[PDB]
């Protein structure tokens, strides 16, 4: 099924973006005074925070490339949620229409 | 209906995750200096905050297991919203297609 293929891919791409995201954030932010997004464990928590949009504001990037990273993480999280939701809708719709004989 | 079965389950699982979530947060965070997520009433508010993604940042976990708890809460909230939305789409689509005779 295309929808599960798409939902599966995005969820693997998301994990990859969260990991590379953590790595790249630290690389982009070290060098910038006042930057807090500068060790891998907290940076990875930051990435999860960001992908989900949970907005604690305990950590955020202060640099251009940190912020670019942030956006790729947001979009990957947002994209994968839309593809999961759309896959869940496709599943339910095709199952409801077989539950009607249609 | 599968979609309402799924939407109903997730909403019961969400309430359960919010309650266990509050309990586990406090257990994970007590022990960690500076932790604020350390009494049940505010921890339960924290859980709602987190599941919804409303991002006030008045409370957040500072520990590994607090943060793991946070993620299960986020995902439970995110998952249950996607299943409700997908159920609402299935309902409307099957009702629109009966409103066309189809």
């Amino acid at each position, epitope marked *: 099924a295309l929808h599960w293929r798409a939902a599966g891919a995005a969820t693997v791409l998301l994990v990859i973006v969260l990991l590379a995201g953590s*790595y790249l954030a*630290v*690389l982009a*932010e*070290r*060098g*910038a*005074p*006042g*930057a*807090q997004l*500068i*060790t*891998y*464990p907290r940076a990875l928590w930051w990435s999860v925070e960001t992908a989900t949009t949970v907005g604690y504001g305990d950590l955020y990037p202060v640099t251009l490339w940190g912020r670019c990273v942030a956006v790729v993480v947001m979009v990957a999280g947002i994209t994968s949620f839309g593809l999961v939701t759309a896959a869940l809708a496709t599943w339910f719709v095709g199952r409801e229409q077989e539950r009607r004989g249609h | 209906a599968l979609h309402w079965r799924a939407a109903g389950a997730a909403t019961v699982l969400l309430v359960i995750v919010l309650l266990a979530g509050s309990y586990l947060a406090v257990l994970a965070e007590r022990g*960690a*200096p*500076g932790a604020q997520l350390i009494t049940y009433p505010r921890a339960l508010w924290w859980s709602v905050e987190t599941a919804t993604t409303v991002g006030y940042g008045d409370l957040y976990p*500072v520990t590994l297991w607090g943060r793991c708890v946070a993620v299960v809460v986020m995902v439970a909230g995110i998952t249950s919203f996607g299943l409700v939305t997908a159920a609402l789409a299935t309902w409307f689509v099957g009702r629109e297609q009966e409103r066309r005779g189809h």
Partner: antibody
């Protein structure tokens, strides 16, 4: 075994330039940073800069006069600090240290004593 | 850029007493503070990471506490091998910074 290897000493003439080395061993990850720290005799520790060798990116203490340039060889896993145009203010023990990208210096080299004199 | 103040600069204690080194940060840094011992002519050695987390192969009499801006290294039952300079270091914000050190005299 000894995790970070540095020369014991380096003598340098006023105005001249020296390239210090820090050979690493033990567990290595692409996420490791090598830091350089300066100690003048009788004084404290002073952070100079850091490098991520598996990416070549280096950052410097912008609060002091920039005497250092950091480089790395990924095949021999050596970190280099090029110190240039040295005066006697630059005489000190220079340590290298390893950080696993988690904020603390788990292992240090024994230090290179740099003396600047004619 | 985070300033770490260590008081006092020299701590004189009696053998067997419990000793405490102070490290105050210029702004709130959670528990992102680490401690080092540097004996005479030796290189620094990590004693405590993240305010209170023990390190393998460090005597059980070294401990740490604190959070925010106030941090303490304690030694239970001080002894001769403890004679050394002690530094704190923060990793909360770029750049990492060290305190100025406290010397332990017995």
């Amino acid at each position: 075994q000894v995790q970070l290897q540095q020369p014991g000493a380096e003598l340098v003439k006023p105005g001249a330039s020296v390239k210090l080395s820090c050979k690493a061993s033990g567990y290595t990850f692409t996420s490791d940073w090598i830091h350089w720290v300066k100690q003048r005799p009788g004084h404290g520790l002073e952070w100079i800069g850091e490098i991520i060798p598996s990416y070549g990116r280096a950052n410097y203490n912008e609060k002091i006069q920039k005497k250092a340039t950091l480089t790395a060889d990924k095949s021999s896993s050596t970190a280099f600090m090029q110190l240039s145009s040295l005066t006697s203010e630059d005489s000190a023990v220079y340590y290298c240290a390893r950080e696993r990208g988690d904020g603390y210096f788990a292992v240090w080299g024994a230090g290179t004593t740099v003396t600047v004199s004619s | 850029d985070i300033l770490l103040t260590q008081s006092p600069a020299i701590l004189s204690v009696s053998p067997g007493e419990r000793v405490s080194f102070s490290c105050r940060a210029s702004q709130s840094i959670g528990t992102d503070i680490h401690w080092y011992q540097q004996r005479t002519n030796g290189s620094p050695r990590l004693l405590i990471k993240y305010a209170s987390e023990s390190i393998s192969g460090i005597p059980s009499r070294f401990s740490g506490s604190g959070s925010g801006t106030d941090f303490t290294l304690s030694i239970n039952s001080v002894e001769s091998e403890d004679i050394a300079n002690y530094y704190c270091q923060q990793s909360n914000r770029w750049p990492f910074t060290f305190g100025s050190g406290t010397k332990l005299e017995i």
